[PDB]
Amino acid sequence: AVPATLSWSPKVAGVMIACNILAIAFGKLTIKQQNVGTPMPSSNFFGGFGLGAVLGTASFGHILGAGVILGLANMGV
Amino acid sequence: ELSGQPPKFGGSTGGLLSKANREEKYAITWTSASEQVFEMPTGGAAIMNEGENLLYLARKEQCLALGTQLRTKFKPKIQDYKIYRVYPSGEVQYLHPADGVFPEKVNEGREAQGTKTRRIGQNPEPVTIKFSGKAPYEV
Amino acid sequence: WLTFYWHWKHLGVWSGNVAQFNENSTYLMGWFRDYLWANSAQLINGYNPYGVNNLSVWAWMFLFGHLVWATGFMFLISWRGYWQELIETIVWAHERTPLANLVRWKDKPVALSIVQARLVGLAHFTVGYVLTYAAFLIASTAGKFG
Amino acid sequence: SHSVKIYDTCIGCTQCVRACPLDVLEMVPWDGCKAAQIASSPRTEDCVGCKRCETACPTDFLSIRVYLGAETTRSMGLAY
Amino acid sequence: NQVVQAYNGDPFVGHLSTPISDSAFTRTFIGNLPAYRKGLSPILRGLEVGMAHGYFLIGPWTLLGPLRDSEYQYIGGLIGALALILVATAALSSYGLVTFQGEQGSGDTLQTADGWSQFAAGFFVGGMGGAFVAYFLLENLSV
Amino acid sequence: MDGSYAASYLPWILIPMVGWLFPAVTMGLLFIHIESEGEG
Amino acid sequence: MDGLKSFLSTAPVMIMALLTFTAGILIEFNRFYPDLLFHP
Amino acid sequence: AKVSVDNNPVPTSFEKWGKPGHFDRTLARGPKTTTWIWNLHANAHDFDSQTSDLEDVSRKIFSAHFGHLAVVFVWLSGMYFHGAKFSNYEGWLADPTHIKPSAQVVWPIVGQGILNGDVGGGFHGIQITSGLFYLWRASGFTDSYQLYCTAIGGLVMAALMLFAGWFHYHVKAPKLEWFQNVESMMNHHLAGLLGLGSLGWAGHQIHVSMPINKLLDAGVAPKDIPLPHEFILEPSKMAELYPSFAQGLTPFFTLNWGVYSDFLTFKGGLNPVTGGLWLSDTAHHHLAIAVLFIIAGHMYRTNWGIGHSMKEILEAHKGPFTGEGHKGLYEILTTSWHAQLAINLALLGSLTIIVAQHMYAMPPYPYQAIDYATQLSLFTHHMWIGGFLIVGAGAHGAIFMVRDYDPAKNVNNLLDRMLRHRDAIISHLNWVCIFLGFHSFGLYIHNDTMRALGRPQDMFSDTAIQLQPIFAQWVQHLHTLAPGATAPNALATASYAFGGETIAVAGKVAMMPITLGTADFMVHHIHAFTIHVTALILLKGVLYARSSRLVPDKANLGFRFPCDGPGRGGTCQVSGWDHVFLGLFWMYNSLSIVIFHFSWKMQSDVWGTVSPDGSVTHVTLGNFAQSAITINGWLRDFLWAQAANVINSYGSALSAYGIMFLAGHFVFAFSLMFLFSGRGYWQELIESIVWAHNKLNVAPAIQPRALSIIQGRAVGVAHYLLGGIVTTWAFFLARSLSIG
Ligand code: CLA
Ligand code: CLA
Ligand code: CLA
Numbered sequence A: 001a002v003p004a005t006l007s008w009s010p011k012v013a014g015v016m017i018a019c020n021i022l023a024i025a026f027g028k029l030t031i032k033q034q035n036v037g038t039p040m041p042s043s044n045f046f047g048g049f050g051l052g053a054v055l056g057t058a059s060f061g062h063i064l065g066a067g068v069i070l071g072l073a074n075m076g077v
Numbered sequence B: 001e002l003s004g005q006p007p008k009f010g011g012s013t014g015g016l017l018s019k020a021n022r023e024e025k026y027a028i029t030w031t032s033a034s035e036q037v038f039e040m041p042t043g044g045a046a047i048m049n050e051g052e053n054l055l056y057l058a059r060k061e062q063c064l065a066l067g068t069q070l071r072t073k074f075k076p077k078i079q080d081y082k083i084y085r086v087y088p089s090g091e092v093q094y095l096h097p098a099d100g101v102f103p104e105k106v107n108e109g110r111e112a113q114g115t116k117t118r119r120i121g122q123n124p125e126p127v128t129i130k131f132s133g134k135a136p137y138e139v
Numbered sequence C: 001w002l003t004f005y006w007h008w009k010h011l012g013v014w015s016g017n018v019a020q021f022n023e024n025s026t027y028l029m030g031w032f033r034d035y036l037w038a039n040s041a042q043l044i045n046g047y048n049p050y051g052v053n054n055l056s057v058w059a060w061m062f063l064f065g066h067l068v069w070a071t072g073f074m075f076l077i078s079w080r081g082y083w084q085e086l087i088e089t090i091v092w093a094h095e096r097t098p099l100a101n102l103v104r105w106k107d108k109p110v111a112l113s114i115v116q117a118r119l120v121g122l123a124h125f126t127v128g129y130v131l132t133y134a135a136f137l138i139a140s141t142a143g144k145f146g
Numbered sequence D: 001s002h003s004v005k006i007y008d009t010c011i012g013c014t015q016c017v018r019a020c021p022l023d024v025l026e027m028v029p030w031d032g033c034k035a036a037q038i039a040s041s042p043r044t045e046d047c048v049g050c051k052r053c054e055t056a057c058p059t060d061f062l063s064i065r066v067y068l069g070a071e072t073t074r075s076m077g078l079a080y
Numbered sequence E: 001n002q003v004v005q006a007y008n009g010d011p012f013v014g015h016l017s018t019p020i021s022d023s024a025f026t027r028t029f030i031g032n033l034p035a036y037r038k039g040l041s042p043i044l045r046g047l048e049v050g051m052a053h054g055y056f057l058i059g060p061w062t063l064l065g066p067l068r069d070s071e072y073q074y075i076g077g078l079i080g081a082l083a084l085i086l087v088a089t090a091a092l093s094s095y096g097l098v099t100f101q102g103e104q105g106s107g108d109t110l111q112t113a114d115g116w117s118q119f120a121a122g123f124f125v126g127g128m129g130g131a132f133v134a135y136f137l138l139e140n141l142s143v
Numbered sequence F: 001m002d003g004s005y006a007a008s009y010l011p012w013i014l015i016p017m018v019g020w021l022f023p024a025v026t027m028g029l030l031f032i033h034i035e036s037e038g039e040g
Numbered sequence G: 001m002d003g004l005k006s007f008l009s010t011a012p013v014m015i016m017a018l019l020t021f022t023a024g025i026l027i028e029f030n031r032f033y034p035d036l037l038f039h040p
Numbered sequence H: 001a002k003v004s005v006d007n008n009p010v011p012t013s014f015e016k017w018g019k020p021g022h023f024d025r026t027l028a029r030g031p032k033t034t035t036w037i038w039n040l041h042a043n044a045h046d047f048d049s050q051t052s053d054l055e056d057v058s059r060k061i062f063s064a065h066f067g068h069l070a071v072v073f074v075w076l077s078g079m080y081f082h083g084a085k086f087s088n089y090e091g092w093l094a095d096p097t098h099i100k101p102s103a104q105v106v107w108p109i110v111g112q113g114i115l116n117g118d119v120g121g122g123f124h125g126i127q128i129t130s131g132l133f134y135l136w137r138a139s140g141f142t143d144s145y146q147l148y149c150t151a152i153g154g155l156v157m158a159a160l161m162l163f164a165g166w167f168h169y170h171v172k173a174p175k176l177e178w179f180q181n182v183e184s185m186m187n188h189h190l191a192g193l194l195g196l197g198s199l200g201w202a203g204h205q206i207h208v209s210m211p212i213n214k215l216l217d218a219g220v221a222p223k224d225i226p227l228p229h230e231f232i233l234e235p236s237k238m239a240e241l242y243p244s245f246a247q248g249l250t251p252f253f254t255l256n257w258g259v260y261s262d263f264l265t266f267k268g269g270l271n272p273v274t275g276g277l278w279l280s281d282t283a284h285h286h287l288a289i290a291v292l293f294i295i296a297g298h299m300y301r302t303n304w305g306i307g308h309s310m311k312e313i314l315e316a317h318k319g320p321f322t323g324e325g326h327k328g329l330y331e332i333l334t335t336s337w338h339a340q341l342a343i344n345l346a347l348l349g350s351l352t353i354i355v356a357q358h359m360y361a362m363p364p365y366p367y368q369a370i371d372y373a374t375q376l377s378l379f380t381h382h383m384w385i386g387g388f389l390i391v392g393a394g395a396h397g398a399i400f401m402v403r404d405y406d407p408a409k410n411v412n413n414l415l416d417r418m419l420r421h422r423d424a425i426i427s428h429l430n431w432v433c434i435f436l437g438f439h440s441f442g443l444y445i446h447n448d449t450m451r452a453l454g455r456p457q458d459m460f461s462d463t464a465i466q467l468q469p470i471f472a473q474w475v476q477h478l479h480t481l482a483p484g485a486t487a488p489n490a491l492a493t494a495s496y497a498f499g500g501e502t503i504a505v506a507g508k509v510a511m512m513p514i515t516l517g518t519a520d521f522m523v524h525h526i527h528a529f530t531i532h533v534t535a536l537i538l539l540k541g542v543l544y545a546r547s548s549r550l551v552p553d554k555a556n557l558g559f560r561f562p563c564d565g566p567g568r569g570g571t572c573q574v575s576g577w578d579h580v581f582l583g584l585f586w587m588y589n590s591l592s593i594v595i596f597h598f599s600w601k602m603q604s605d606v607w608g609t610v611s612p613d614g615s616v617t618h619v620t621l622g623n624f625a626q627s628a629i630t631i632n633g634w635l636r637d638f639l640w641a642q643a644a645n646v647i648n649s650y651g652s653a654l655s656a657y658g659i660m661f662l663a664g665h666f667v668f669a670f671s672l673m674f675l676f677s678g679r680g681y682w683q684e685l686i687e688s689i690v691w692a693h694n695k696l697n698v699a700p701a702i703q704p705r706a707l708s709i710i711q712g713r714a715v716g717v718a719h720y721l722l723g724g725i726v727t728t729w730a731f732f733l734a735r736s737l738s739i740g
């Protein structure tokens, strides 16, 4: 009765980018210090985000995506 | 008689007990040059206000400890505090300083008390004073 | 020390087994094992989960003496100021409690004085010492011979 | 209350008065020492018997001696 | 919303206001107790206190005492309660004799020699009554 | 608690007084005496 | 260095060095000649 | 970068080595009395009192911590070397159920060669109870050369730690701002130390420990098992042992984690072959906690504005009842080392207590549960360590309160409110201590008197008035049903203490259900009473260190002073140090009762031998239930009965234990010289002896003095605790080595 997991497929991808996008939406409206320290080239493509904020929101999106994918694989779809 | 705004304190369980209203209590008053934080002898920190202050404590030792803290732990040294004994009837007895000059420095007009004209080794033997209500130092 | 020597030697004499004391009293482990451990077998069994025999009172007094001897230790080790402050707290608790403020003491409760504390510790100590040894000796001799 | 006595070996260093926490001691003029001052115990009914004055005395033996005696509420230093 | 403050606006007393000591409900409930009520004579105060303190004392010695598995069980509980009430009355009388010596301030009728005597007598009577009524309730097939 | 010695009923009544009555009476008298303010 | 020599000469170092010297003497003697209850 | 250092602040010279007492101004002048010696050894490592600059104190603390790390590394390297050269580990590995572990060999000089008992396999040496052999077997050790290399690496690491201390103090000393980067320190120490350490250990286990232990448990001889690097070099063997290893690292990056289910399980329980935990369960465990700790990192704002701030969180959690709330605590814990020491000591001591109480119920090491001596030794050792650390927290907190507490920065904050209702706290705690002691120890004394009077039906026992721990039984029932019901993917219970089958290895019970009855109720509430009393003593020390109604200026007197005087009726033992001194004894009492309960219950209801039929015969039979309810039962069925193996140890290999047993009973008594007496008597005696030595003109220049009051109390408590703990250690080791 080992928990069921999903092999890689475009659906798992779409879940990954969806989670990353909603994590970006969350981070834009929550982070107190959006741009501090190392910046990134060609700003305003990242909503005025520095390197640290970008990495933080990407990592949070990956964590959300991993949790969501594993939970959904435990149930159907 | 005794005037001064009490320091702003939140209240603690270390304060007075029934002895204050039954036997006596003690009062300490001083002039503060600025509203600043000092330490209650009974536990906790309270702010004292600019101008006159008045505090009720249960023991003379607590009042003198507060006076020592006032004299030592503040750059604008507070040397003007006064300690009184307050009786339940209403009598107020001035205790410290006695004549207005601190006992550490010698001031004229004081009277010697408890001073013996001999040295500690010259006290009488107990056997020579026994069966009388006296002690070798009492003689 | 005196009574231990007398009692062990006379136990050997009365049982006829003088050799046990003779060859076991030269080292302290023989004192610990052949005298104390061996002769407590019947005393501590005065009352058991199974029943009670005539040595039950002596076992109770043995434990009682051990207890009083232990109790003297805290008048002998812990000293006044700790208990004085503790009594201050208890006095606050009594004075601040409703329905207990109607009852007040006549003499202000204070901790025992230093000399009185030493005397009380020595008293509990001596009582425990005497009761413990008396119980052990009586129980051991009564079980062996009496 | 306790008794406090000052003997003629005092050198008038005033350490005992400074060390007293209940303001029992005082400095009075004198002539037996170079400092021309000797300790005194006028307010002896407030003494608790902490022996801080004795600890502060630097003479070969204490020029100030405290003899504990009758115990009052003040002597016990009780707050209740 | 500070709910804990100084005791009756006096910071320098050894107490401070809490929702347990200076609550309106607390004061209302503690002031209506028999020992703290208004207009009660001391003997009536003693009756009211002793009735409860003797009624509740029947509990132990009934399901726990040496006679707890026989027909002499409620009897033993009653006897123990009565003896405890008697010792309590003796202690109360001794305290009243010792505490109030000479000067009898009439500020409080309970804090008075004769007031405490009435309180002790009423406590004895109330303890007797409460213990006996509890015994009557707890018994079966009474003569 | 039951004995075969002569007048075995005596401990039935003597021990309680030595156990309760005498200690309680002595406690009360001493407590009153040591607490009686004044007159010495 | 002078400081090292002074440190080596302090009381604990001397006491422990002498104790190990004595202990080594006793242990070696007891190894090469054990069980000496008396001068036989 | 937030790094800031100072170059060559203190030159490296040997001159100050020749002048002891250089740190103290009062001691560097030169000794006149013997007290100067005792002060020198006492104020050495108190850097806060030596200097007023906080940066210098922090630098000294950093290098001293480097030194303690070097010492611990030397200890570990010594352990590995003595297990590699003077041990039968290679012999024990082939026959673990018939060979006793041993890693200490005794030279035959004066007859101590009798200590070299027969530990099986033809080896003669002292049996060890630390459990190092089981840890090494779990780590994948199979040859003594690997242990020798580990010892060499440990020595190298110790030398590196020493050089690190010398460099980071005498050459490049960090700045104060560097030390106060609590956010950066916490991030690096949660993610870089705990998380990375757990990840590295999980990698080691998966790639080394599991294959070796799987081959070992099957029955393969240690010499046949491939060396650990061969599994990495040739992954064919790894794929053979675990099929999913053929899939490589692809499923990890595609979140197809389930394929790794064969070597990352959630079995729970014990391995039947060895009696330890499953290494796959431990692998997924340490991997999961590694992930959790790395995620717990990246939490505090350090350099890129992306993170929380500790001060904001502290000052934001305030409520109606608490005035200013957690305000000013950040400045307290970033400017005073003593408060940090107190918090860390308390948490660490509780952590080792948790370690002791959890390592016995779920034994993680192979063949450890069946080695009763190792179980008891580990439990008691880490129990004592935890107790000592908790008392140290209680001490250094009072030190902080006396020294580093400043009323100006604490107005209506939680610390001040604590200092305001301290009388209420102490009074209610004193009442609860009295109530607990009365009712519990009165149950004990009541049972004693009922048994002595011949009325066993009036006792507090399972046959008599029950007093059953219904809540503990309910939680045991819940944890027994957890696999499948509330933890569906778990296969067995967390431990068999709650319930289940009896796991037994080599005809010896490894773990069976631990039933709680009336005796367990009484002992657990006795534990509660003792713990609350020790907490009361230490809390009174901490709260009342500044002042009290008796002495209103104790803060000015210091933290370590004997008394205020014979006045006020007597003011003995009022300092916070005296409260620590008093709490040490109560910690000893509580921990002694705890270890006694553990030992007796383990011997009477779990440990024992299982027959081929399945019947379990316990070490002391089922006597705990009907004897541990009276003090006489504790005295007769536990101390007298189980001390036979330590009093009859003379003439055999266990004789040393017997000797040490008596040794303890001596030192304890010796301590009563110092606790029961005072220093004036000894001073007068020294006066007479000084006259004697003066008559012969042999008087010493350093005038001898009797020990100070504080020193006398410290010596008494030290020798007392040493004697008692040594007695208990000898008794426990002899009993546990003599019960098979
Ligand atoms: C919509 C998306 C989605 C869905 C459907 C699921 C679905 C599931 N997740 Mg899941 N998860 C998600 C998103 C999702 N998750 C995200 C975004 C994350 C990242 C935050 C996680 C992280 C996560 C973890 C870490 C775990 C799951 C687990 C599970 C499964 C069991 C949960 C359950 O009811 O048992 C649990 C039900 C209980 C009643 C148990 C709760 C009792 C716990 C022990 C209390 C512990 C208290 C705690 C330690 C103290 C607080 C700490 C402090 C910080 C406050 C379930 C299939 C679990 C799993 O895989 O099971 C095999 C599991 O361990 N999820
Ligand atoms: C705290 C410890 C403790 C406890 C709980 C008990 C309990 C008991 N003993 Mg025992 N005993 C003890 C210690 C204790 N003993 C000790 C130390 C000795 C001396 C060595 C004895 C000697 C002894 C004898 C000689 C006998 C007992 C007997 C008994 C039983 C009935 C008599 C009794 O005590 O209750 C009766 C009731 C009281 C004594 C008064 C209790 C006070 C009340 C319950 C306090 C309640 C406070 C309340 C909850 C607060 C509420 C606040 C708010 C709600 C208002 C009972 C099971 C008798 C028996 O036969 O046992 C079966 C008996 O003959 N005991
Ligand atoms: C000091 C000597 C002494 C002692 C220790 C005892 C001891 C005892 N007697 Mg006893 N007795 C004594 C002398 C003594 N007797 C004498 C001289 C008589 C003849 C009058 C009796 C007649 C007597 C009777 C008739 C009974 C006892 C009983 C008992 C037992 C119950 C406890 C008790 O004494 O109260 C009860 C006994 C008394 C109150 C007797 C009066 C005490 C004597 C007469 C005076 C002693 C005063 C003493 C010196 C005061 C010392 C002060 C000091 C403590 C500071 C107990 C074993 C009872 C018993 O056998 O129970 C099993 C019992 O029924 N005794």
Ligand code: CLA
Pocket (backbone or CB within 6 Å): G017, G020, H074, H075, H077, H078, H079, H081, H082, H086, H104, H105, H106, H107
């Ligand atoms: C916690 C660390 C630790 C501990 C407790 C032990 C304990 C032990 N080791 Mg051991 N060892 C360790 C680490 C440790 N080792 C390490 C790291 C290594 C690798 C280098 C070794 C290598 C080792 C070997 C090779 C041997 C031992 C042996 C022994 C046993 C005999 C004791 C001994 O050597 O004294 C022997 C006596 C002395 C050393 C006394 C000599 C004088 C001393 C050094 C006085 C010190 C001052 C001195 C005068 C120098 C002045 C210095 C000054 C400037 C400060 C003993 C059980 C022996 C053994 O078990 O044989 C069966 C053995 O042969 N050990």
Ligand code: CLA
Pocket (backbone or CB within 6 Å): H061, H062, H063, H065, H066, H069, H178, H179, H181, H182, H184, H185, H186, H188, H189, H191, H192, H193
């Ligand atoms: C990932 C980074 C990292 C790591 C691993 C550590 C680890 C440690 N720090 Mg630390 N620290 C860090 C960053 C880090 N720190 C930063 C950034 C700061 C500044 C804000 C500090 C400031 C700091 C202070 C002020 C103190 C420490 C202390 C300690 C030690 C505490 C004792 C302990 O845990 O015992 C466990 C011990 C070990 C596990 C032994 C580790 C031995 C070395 C030093 C570890 C080297 C690991 C390294 C990554 C190389 C390994 C990789 C590869 C070879 C496998 C511990 C070794 C305390 C101390 O003095 O210790 C020296 C101390 O007081 N830290």
Ligand code: CLA
Pocket (backbone or CB within 6 Å): H041, H042, H043, H044, H045, H046, H047, H048, H341, H388, H389, H390, H391, H392, H393, H395, H396, H399, H559, H560, H577, H580, H718
């Ligand atoms: C992380 C652990 C830790 C650290 C870093 C410190 C750090 C410090 N402590 Mg602290 N302490 C701790 C744990 C710790 N403590 C614990 C667990 C306790 C409870 C026992 C205490 C109790 C304590 C007290 C009571 C005092 C300190 C003091 C101090 C300060 C230095 C003075 C000192 O003790 O050195 C000098 C150290 C010694 C003289 C110890 C030598 C004597 C030991 C006890 C002998 C040990 C014998 C050994 C166990 C067995 C040998 C057997 C023999 C036959 C060979 C310093 C801030 C003192 C202070 O006020 O500083 C401000 C102080 O008075 N500590």
Ligand SMILES: CCCCCCCCCCCCCCCC(=O)OC[C@H](COP(=O)(O)OC[C@@H](O)CO)OC(=O)CCCCCCCCCCCCCCC
Pocket (backbone or CB within 6 Å): H317, H318, H319, H320, H321, H322, H325, H326
């Ligand atoms: C689980 C069953 C077995 C254990 C049962 C024992 C429970 C006994 C008491 C109930 C706990 C109630 C906590 C609520 C209390 C609570 O949550 O307070 C919280 C409250 C603070 O409220 P605020 O929201 O103002 O707090 C803001 C805070 O975040 C501070 O910044 O503090 C106070 O009111 C003062 C505390 C008085 C505390 C009284 C002392 C109680 C001591 C005894 C507790 C013993 C528990 C021992 C076992 C753990």
